[PDB]
Ligand binder design. Sequence first.
Ligand SMILES: [Mg+2]
Ligand SMILES: [Zn+2]
Ligand SMILES: [Zn+2]
Ligand SMILES: [Zn+2]
Lengths: 269, 559, 182, 112, 171, 97, 88, 107
Amino acid sequence: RLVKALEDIMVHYDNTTRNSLGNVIQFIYGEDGMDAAHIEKQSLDTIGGSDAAFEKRYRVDLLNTDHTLDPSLLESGSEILGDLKLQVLLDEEYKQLVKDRKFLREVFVDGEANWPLPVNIRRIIQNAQQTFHIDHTKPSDLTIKDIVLGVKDLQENLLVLRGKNEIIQNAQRDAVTLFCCLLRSRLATRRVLQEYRLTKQAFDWVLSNIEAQFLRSVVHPGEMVGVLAAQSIGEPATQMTLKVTSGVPRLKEILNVAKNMKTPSLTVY
Amino acid sequence: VGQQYSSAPLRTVKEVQFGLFSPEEVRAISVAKIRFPETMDETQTRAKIGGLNDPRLGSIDRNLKCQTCQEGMNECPGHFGHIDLAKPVFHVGFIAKIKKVCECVCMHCGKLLLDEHNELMRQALAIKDSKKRFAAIWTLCKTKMVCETDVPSEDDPTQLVSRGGCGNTQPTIRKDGLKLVGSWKKDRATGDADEPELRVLSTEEILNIFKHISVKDFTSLGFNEVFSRPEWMILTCLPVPPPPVRPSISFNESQRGEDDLTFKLADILKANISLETLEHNGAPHHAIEEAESLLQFHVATYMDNDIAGQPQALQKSGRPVKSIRARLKGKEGRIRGNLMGKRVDFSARTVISGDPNLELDQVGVPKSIAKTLTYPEVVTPYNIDRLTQLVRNGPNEHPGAKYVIRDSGDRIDLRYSKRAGDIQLQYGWKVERHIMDNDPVLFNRQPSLHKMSMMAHRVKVIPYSTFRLNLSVTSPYNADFDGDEMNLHVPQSEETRAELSQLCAVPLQIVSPQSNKPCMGIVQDTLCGIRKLTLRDTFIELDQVLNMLYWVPDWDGVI
Amino acid sequence: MNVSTSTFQTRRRRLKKVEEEENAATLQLGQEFQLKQINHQGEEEELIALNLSEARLVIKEALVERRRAFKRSQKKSETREKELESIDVLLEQTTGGNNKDLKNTMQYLTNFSRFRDQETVGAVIQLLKSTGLHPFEVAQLGSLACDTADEAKTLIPSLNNKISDDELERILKELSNLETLY
Amino acid sequence: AGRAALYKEVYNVIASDGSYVNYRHMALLVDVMTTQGGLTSVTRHGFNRSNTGALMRCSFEETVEILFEAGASAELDDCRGVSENVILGQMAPIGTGAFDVMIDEESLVKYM
Amino acid sequence: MFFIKDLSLNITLHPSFFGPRMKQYLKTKLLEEVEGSCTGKFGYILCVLDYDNIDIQRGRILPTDGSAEFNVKYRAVVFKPFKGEVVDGTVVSCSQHGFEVQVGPMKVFVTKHLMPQDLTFNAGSNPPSYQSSEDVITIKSRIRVKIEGCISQVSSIHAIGSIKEDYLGAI
Amino acid sequence: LRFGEMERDCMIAHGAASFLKERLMEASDAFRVHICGICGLMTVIAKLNHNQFECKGCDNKIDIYQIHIPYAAKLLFQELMAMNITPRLYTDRSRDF
Amino acid sequence: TLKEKAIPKDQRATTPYMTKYERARILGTRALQISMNAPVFVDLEGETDPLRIAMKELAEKKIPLVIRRYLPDGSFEDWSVEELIVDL
Amino acid sequence: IFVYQNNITPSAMKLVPSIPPATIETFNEAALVVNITHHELVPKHIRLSSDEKRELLKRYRLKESQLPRIQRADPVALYLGLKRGEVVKIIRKSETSGRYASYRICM
RNA sequence: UUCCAGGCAU
DNA sequence: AGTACTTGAGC
DNA sequence: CTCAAGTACTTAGGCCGGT
Ligand SMILES: [Mg+2]
Ligand SMILES: [Zn+2]
Ligand SMILES: [Zn+2]
Ligand SMILES: [Zn+2]
């Protein structure tokens, strides 16, 4: 039934999920236009952790002897202290990350931070490491401008919907968001130079990779998602070796628009 | 396929228009007058009586003749004939709606029973939908039972206006057998009529009252002026399917066959002649009707035999007699079992036994099948040399082939053609050859509920009669070896295979999207062993380590 | 396959092939020749009538310009009876050969052509086409030598009321003057 | 809020066995049921009733009965359906067949 | 009479010829399958105008086999006779039943009983003829006929005409 | 062996359209009929020899098409005709959308 | 009723890259043709298999094919083998 | 708008479409005791001008049909006073992409 | 072929 | 069998 | 005009004797 009830659903060249009637059934496949295959449980750090921790990590104050970056990490280090024009960027960064904190905590009431997301970043840096022998001793060579500004751009290219106008463009931001969050969680200034002494080179690399590695993780217009998603569910259906109506029978209870479900509960808080 | 060239411009179906035959179309189209009911046999004389089956329609017995259209059997699809009914009969399947239309229109005139004049009607006359509309329309006037000519117009309900005529009450109808019936009234204890007033609704009656139904009323309801005029839901002339639909399984010579269908028609026919000869002659009148509904039966059961008024028209012996509807019914039906799924050529099935020596994507194939399953390959200067060797190499020594086809639509059977050893391949010729080592193929283990229940493997022709597949590709097919068999199909076009190798190969299917996590991996023996081998407590000396190193294909050759 | 040869106008042939008009020089020509035919450019465009000779010019023109593009990539004046032989060769070069028709359509068009000269022809048309007359008439009135408005509006009955007997007369006479000699 | 519970629930049917299904899948289905307007059921009664071509719906339970109502209501079929082409023996508008391939003489010459 | 309609044609080409001199063969094919054709629908196809600017467009590679179907948009000179259309051509054959006059790529026939009465029919005539008071018709003798009825066949649209009207007959 | 429903599905999922068809036509039914450019029926009297294409009744003989579809569908259609249901086949759409 | 053909290469909407189906389909189609004895716009380096040649024609982006992409409503965008990238 | 306590006359209500343009909404009391929209599950919606709407089509080559529908009686439907044809914008959080955009046309 | 029946895939 | 729309029915 | 029968439709997927 499941199959015969989705056959004709696929992703059409614009990234709309329709059928023989072209009746939209999802504007952006999977509410993100990503081909399931290119996904791994990455951790959205920016969400859980004492409000304290957040600071010790992402905070950078070029106007302080205790919160500025130790010039051992950055080459242009000490020569930046006080520079208020930089503490503006450095702030917007920290301000944007904070917006995230309350964003994620707003979509994920749980707090749960491990989720399915395209482009594995731990490893995209993990390689960045040994590929450049990056020594955790010598000082980096990035500019507070390089890091910050370059990340803003990595984003300007993680295209999902190409669209030449407003409406389309807007749906593009939405179709991402969650990713960049993760992105900004891992490409935070402090994190970038302290946690893993990145060089400029190494950096520009990690960036360009996330670039395409992302673009690959998109969804191929042609995919027969209907027949797919169907099996994907009705597959672990037979593999179900089974006080509340549960599992196999209950699943039927569902698909049938159960006019009178055996168990009916009603959990009130 | 269906061979022989035709200057017939060629295309693909884009639209499909469903309609209903017009008793005349059935005639225009028809080539068969179809009078006699008997199969044929020029009265014992084997041939076919210009009566039923082939009084021009397609034919039997490998014989060109078939309205000269010839082409003999294969090619000349069916040629529909007709057979003018006796009296209009209900179309077994439409009946329900024929009732539902009457319940919607008044007889005598054949006009609606709810003009926009009754607002609630408009609401419905706007439900753009030739079905949900006809749904609102019905429920609406299946109440009003008096075809009014005077109703309180859009104006003051004190200023009534007229429309159509005849207010002749309309009898609430109800189903029964293959005929409808309704009961009128006219007062009760007032003056005459009183209680109900039951009358039968003759086909003729209804049909005529339908024909009169307005052209924009056809439209108003759920119909269409060009393909489905309610006045057709009733059969006047009968379209006669030709041989191919109801083949005659002729057992050798001078022996029977004639399809279950062919019988049901021969019946319908007899039951027709019976009727007409009761009219054009000694007509004990309402003694005829008794032999009419008999035709209403056949021509109804011919299309459907599994109804409410049971009587399964038992084809003597008790058999029920497969009505056409049954031929299409779910699974096994022309649809579910013949079009949404077929049996195919170039397919193989045997018992699978795992092997720890084939690459994930390979599939061990028995030399038996490697000589059975072919593949049309084009003679190209590229292979020409090889291809010729295969051919002259014979269709029995493994690497070889069995069929060579020259452009001139004639196949040389390599295993007999007193020129098999000869043959000068011709570029652009085809040479069906043996499945060779490394031919992409579709291998699968039903029940196929996965995308990865079918995958492409590299043919690796091996000995012994088993499909020997790699191990890690064990859990995706849901395959074990306690007597489990698997099916495997062989691509046929340079592009078909392309589709396999570029999307269906196991190397690709490695990471399932159904769970954004790989769906294969190391199992059993290797899993059980991979651990033991690991453990700090496990060491290995040079002699062995060297053999191990070697066993790994890539090994940089540097200890 | 060999999709015969379609036109440039699509008519929704919905089952009812019933109607198919009757042909008659009553200016009633099959749809394929309506006053309003759709130029392949999608643009509408008045029918296209060619009158003997004026047609012979068309053919011969592209039929020769064809000989050019038949040699462009091979590296990579009237006389009635003399022309009949001149075109005969032009044919045995850029034509089809078994195109028995075209050869005959030229011989017929060359013997019976009226004005064997491009200018003289355009001249005719500047005169004719400025009548409001259906190109069909504009054609006939050109390729058919007439004298009285009788011989004219008799053989070209589509006229009759369209242009007065004297007007058509004036014009008819214009053609005999312009009527290229031989 | 309805789709919500439908997904929420169905999820607890596949997650009950511990298993894992990537949202998108389940979500699609939950959607296909909801979009239409209310709670379209995955059964002969519900889903297989939409304006899909008749040839399609025909291949799932109502079969004959459906085709009848096709000639009756004189429907028209797009042949946009997976099934359609399958029955018609034509390449279907699916992945490989989601576009047309063509020879552009232009390039076909600048290549030589 | 004669016209110039804008037609199209679907020629399926073999991948074989998917070379450089493609347009070359395409056009050449078009010409084989058109110049000299004939259908009662457009009549006699006689010559494709503008061999040069023939439109081919991107043809599409078919399914199963590689062949690609091209839709060629051309234009050409054609001639479709009409009931009533008056035309004069050269006489061809002539028998006891009448003389077949040829007008263009076409042949119009005139019946004994479709011309004037006084117009006899000479039997002992070499070549065969038809006489009258002051008229002699035969082989060459140019004529002028009124196309009475058209009968389309194979790739040849025949017809019947009369000269028993006014201003008709010899010229 | 049968390439039934379950199996169709897998290929549809894969998006291997060319192949699906191949196993449905060239590897099974596959057959060639003729249509009336008008009444979308198989009426047509193809004498694929003298070319005569008539089809009459609807009286065409000039606008006709050749089409490849599974003999199962040829049957399926004729079978629907025998029940007085017309499965019209049109080489082109007009509907659009 | 839109004879208004499709989109102009300008205002090109779709994806800049090739879909796995597209390459899959092209490689096949082109192969099929090379095996049909079609012309080969590369330098066969002994490559005797077609899907091999196509595999190569595809790498020197010397396949003379056009991917006519279709949009849910009938309109379309034309993409040339050359154009489309290949991160497939 | 209107807030009936325990009902209205079946004869009364049949006069809400009596004074068009301006239209009338009937609402129950106990049915407003709580605001549904405030519910954990129900995501926010938004009306669309003929422009906001026609733009949604022009930018998605969409037909009214193909557009995902929302009942005319749909709880939220009345909340924001919906009307047969009006379009809504549903915007909710997504475990795959922070926020998802979606449109519902009225029944 | 057809119609029933039975059996196997842990 | 189970189970879901639809028909019929005393109010 | 609103309530309990009335009334009808599939049930997984392949492969392998009697008459
Ligand atoms: Mg087993
Ligand atoms: Zn025949
Ligand atoms: Zn009446
Ligand atoms: Zn016909």
